[PDB]
Design goal:
Layout (H helix, E strand, L loop, with lengths): L2 E7 L7 E7 L4 E8 L5 E3 L24 E11 L5 E13 L2 E14 L1 H4 L6 E4 L16 H5 L7 E5 L6 E5 L12 E4 L8 E9 L5 E9 L6 E3 L1 H8 L6 E3 L4 E5 L7 E5 L2 E5 L5 E4 L6 E4 L1 E3 L6 E3 L1 H4 L3 E5 L5 E5 L2
Parallel strand pairs: 3-8, 4-7, 13-22, 14-21
Antiparallel strand pairs: 1-2, 1-10, 2-3, 2-6, 4-8, 5-6, 6-7, 9-10, 9-23, 11-24, 12-13, 12-17, 14-22, 15-16, 16-20, 17-18, 19-20, 23-24
């Protein structure tokens, strides 16, 4: 089997992407944030505290004839951005772009943190990291991909995120029309439950390539590119007027400035992030100060190849017995 679904930016800055997901019988369609940096499929629901729901579409398990309580199961998650959610668990039928999993754990939120409430466009998350990170207790649950894997034509999914435009998540096949050149595959460590890999270096604009190992995660659920402070400083030093603002919480730059591209290494191959992808607009409405899309990972504890990086490539998440990651230009 295979599946193919369009993913759509939530706003004009590509702050996140939402993909429609069918849950239950008859189908309830929710727009979920596909997150290769986590491993829970959780949704706003009829059980979510009413004051914490503000425009989201909810899953109502009582209206699904295939929903079954996962008795005794609870879940609770906190994300790198400080947001969180928790609740109980049902199993139900979940379909993405034509691909159907029966008995998928659907984690129903009883509580969500303010950032989730305040974002009306995201109805939940669909985790695509390794199932070892799943928070369901007492019995850890499998991700949608893990459940589908054995049935897929090939045990892979791909992320093809658009710049200020829709893109595509495919399951079970590689669309050879969706990228240019070849796909370069690189080793993955699953030791932290992430799609963790090592970039071979970077360049800033037309500058020479610096060969240096950068361990980080391929994370579709993180908006920006977070790299070591040395790398980030080298980038922003090439932008007139850029500075790190402690009050704002990262590098900002005048929108009159021209942003250089940023290249990262995948083996001997190179992915070029165009300068425009690194502009995240005014820090506040009407401000001449713009927020940068490359920021320091110092104090996160890990480097994150988030959407800024991933949307510059066609990315293969290869879930073979020894997982690997593939990157192609497009």
């Amino acid at each position: 089997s295979t599946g193919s679904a369009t993913t759509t930016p939530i706003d004009s800055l590509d702050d996140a992407y939402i993909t429609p997901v069918q849950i239950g019988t008859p189908a309830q369609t929710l727009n979920l944030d596909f997150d290769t940096g986590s491993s829970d499929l959780w949704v706003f629901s009829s059980e979510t505290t009413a004051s914490e729901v503000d425009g989201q579409t909810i899953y109502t398990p009582s209206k699904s004839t295939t929903a079954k309580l996962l008795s005794g199961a609870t879940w609770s998650i906190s994300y790198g951005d400080g947001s969180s959610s928790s609740g109980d668990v049902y199993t139900d039928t979940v379909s993405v772009g034509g691909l159907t999993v029966t008995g998928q754990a659907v984690e129903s939120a009883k509580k969500v943190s303010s950032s989730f409430t305040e974002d009306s466009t995201i109805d939940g998350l669909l985790g695509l990291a390794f199932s070892t990170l799943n928070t369901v207790s007492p019995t850890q649950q499998k991700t949608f991909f893990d459940n589908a894997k054995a049935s897929l034509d090939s045990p892979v999914f791909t992320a093809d995120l658009g710049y200020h435009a829709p893109g595509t998540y495919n399951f079970g096949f590689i669309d050879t029309t969706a990228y240019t050149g070849s796909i370069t595959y690189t080793a993955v460590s699953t030791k932290q439950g992430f799609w963790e890999w090592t970039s071979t270096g970077y360049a800033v604009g037309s500058g020479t390539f610096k060969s240096t190992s950068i361990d980080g995660i391929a994370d579709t659920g993180t908006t920006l590119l977070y790299l070591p402070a040395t790398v980030v400083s080298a980038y922003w030093a090439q932008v007139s007027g850029a500075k790190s603002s402690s009050s704002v919480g990262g590098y900002v730059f005048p929108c009159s400035a021209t942003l250089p591209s940023f290249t990262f290494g995948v083996g001997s191959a190179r992915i070029v992030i165009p300068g425009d992808y690194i502009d995240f607009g005014p820090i506040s409405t009407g401000s001449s100060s713009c927020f940068g899309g490359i920021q320091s990972s110092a104090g996160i504890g890990i480097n994150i190849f988030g959407d800024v990086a991933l949307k510059a490539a066609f990315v293969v998440f290869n879930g073979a017995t020894t997982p690997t990651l593939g990157f192609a230009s497009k």
